[PDB]
Amino acid sequence: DCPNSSVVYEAADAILHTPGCVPCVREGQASRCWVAVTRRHIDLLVGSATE
Protein backbone atom coordinates (compact mmCIF):
# COMPACT_ATOMS: atom_id res chain seq x y z
CA ASP A 1 0.00 0.00 0.00
CA CYS A 2 2.97 2.30 0.92
CA PRO A 3 6.10 0.25 -0.05
CA ASN A 4 9.12 2.58 -0.27
CA SER A 5 8.49 3.95 3.24
CA SER A 6 7.65 0.37 4.63
CA VAL A 7 10.59 0.14 7.11
CA VAL A 8 9.02 3.06 9.09
CA TYR A 9 5.51 1.66 8.90
CA GLU A 10 6.93 -1.67 10.24
CA ALA A 11 8.56 0.25 13.17
CA ALA A 12 5.47 2.40 13.85
CA ASP A 13 3.34 -0.82 13.86
CA ALA A 14 5.80 -2.50 16.33
CA ILE A 15 5.55 0.53 18.72
CA LEU A 16 1.71 0.26 18.74
CA HIS A 17 1.78 -3.51 19.21
CA THR A 18 4.23 -3.04 22.15
CA PRO A 19 1.85 -3.46 25.15
CA GLY A 20 4.59 -2.34 27.57
CA CYS A 21 6.94 0.64 27.42
CA VAL A 22 9.42 1.19 24.56
CA PRO A 23 12.82 1.63 26.27
CA CYS A 24 14.35 5.05 25.40
CA VAL A 25 17.34 7.11 26.51
CA ARG A 26 17.53 10.83 25.68
CA GLU A 27 20.45 12.13 23.56
CA GLY A 28 19.81 15.90 23.99
CA GLN A 29 16.68 16.56 21.88
CA ALA A 30 16.38 13.14 20.21
CA SER A 31 15.85 9.96 22.22
CA ARG A 32 17.33 6.55 21.22
CA CYS A 33 15.00 3.56 21.46
CA TRP A 34 14.92 -0.18 21.05
CA VAL A 35 11.66 -1.59 19.69
CA ALA A 36 11.27 -5.35 19.92
CA VAL A 37 9.53 -7.10 16.99
CA THR A 38 7.34 -10.19 17.99
CA ARG A 39 14.53 -12.91 18.54
CA ARG A 40 15.09 -9.53 16.79
CA HIS A 41 14.64 -5.77 17.45
CA ILE A 42 14.51 -2.37 15.70
CA ASP A 43 16.90 0.48 16.59
CA LEU A 44 15.41 3.95 16.28
CA LEU A 45 16.50 7.51 16.92
CA VAL A 46 13.56 9.93 17.19
CA GLY A 47 13.68 13.67 17.61
CA SER A 48 11.66 16.86 17.24
CA ALA A 49 12.55 19.79 14.96
CA THR A 50 11.14 23.30 14.37
CA GLU A 51 11.51 25.79 11.40
Add this chain to the structure above:
Amino acid sequence: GYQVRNSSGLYHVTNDCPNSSVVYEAADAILHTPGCVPCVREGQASRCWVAVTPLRRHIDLLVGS
Protein backbone atom coordinates in the same frame (compact mmCIF):
# COMPACT_ATOMS: atom_id res chain seq x y z
CA GLY B 1 4.16 13.82 37.99
CA TYR B 2 1.25 16.30 37.29
CA GLN B 3 -2.47 16.75 38.06
CA VAL B 4 -5.58 16.92 35.80
CA ARG B 5 -8.98 18.53 36.51
CA ASN B 6 -11.21 17.25 33.66
CA SER B 7 -15.12 16.76 33.65
CA SER B 8 -15.07 13.34 35.52
CA GLY B 9 -13.11 14.60 38.57
CA LEU B 10 -9.61 15.39 39.88
CA TYR B 11 -6.75 13.07 38.82
CA HIS B 12 -2.94 12.65 39.19
CA VAL B 13 -1.07 11.37 36.14
CA THR B 14 2.48 9.95 35.87
CA ASN B 15 4.13 9.12 32.49
CA ASP B 16 5.56 5.55 32.74
CA CYS B 17 7.89 6.36 29.77
CA PRO B 18 8.91 10.10 29.88
CA ASN B 19 11.75 9.63 27.37
CA SER B 20 9.57 7.47 25.07
CA SER B 21 6.82 10.10 24.56
CA VAL B 22 8.20 11.32 21.11
CA VAL B 23 8.22 7.63 19.92
CA TYR B 24 4.51 7.17 20.70
CA GLU B 25 3.82 10.63 19.20
CA ALA B 26 5.75 9.67 16.01
CA ALA B 27 4.17 6.16 15.76
CA ASP B 28 0.69 7.77 15.90
CA ALA B 29 1.72 10.53 13.41
CA ILE B 30 2.97 7.90 10.88
CA LEU B 31 -0.46 6.16 10.89
CA HIS B 32 -2.36 9.46 10.66
CA THR B 33 -0.11 10.49 7.71
CA PRO B 34 -2.54 10.02 4.76
CA GLY B 35 0.30 10.09 2.21
CA CYS B 36 3.58 8.19 2.58
CA VAL B 37 6.30 9.26 5.03
CA PRO B 38 9.30 10.47 3.01
CA CYS B 39 12.29 8.16 3.73
CA VAL B 40 15.87 7.99 2.43
CA ARG B 41 18.54 5.42 3.15
CA GLU B 42 21.07 7.32 5.32
CA GLY B 43 23.85 4.76 5.90
CA GLN B 44 22.67 1.40 7.25
CA ALA B 45 19.52 3.15 8.50
CA SER B 46 16.45 4.99 7.11
CA ARG B 47 16.12 8.75 7.64
CA CYS B 48 12.44 9.84 7.62
CA TRP B 49 10.47 13.07 8.05
CA VAL B 50 7.10 12.87 9.85
CA ALA B 51 4.76 15.87 9.79
CA VAL B 52 2.94 16.46 13.07
CA THR B 53 -0.70 17.67 13.37
CA PRO B 54 -0.78 21.52 13.98
CA LEU B 55 6.14 28.03 13.29
CA ARG B 56 5.80 24.54 11.68
CA ARG B 57 7.27 21.51 13.52
CA HIS B 58 7.94 17.92 12.32
CA ILE B 59 9.55 14.71 13.72
CA ASP B 60 12.89 13.48 12.41
CA LEU B 61 13.65 9.78 12.83
CA LEU B 62 16.17 7.10 11.86
CA VAL B 63 15.11 3.44 11.78
CA GLY B 64 17.49 0.46 11.55
CA SER B 65 17.95 -3.30 12.06
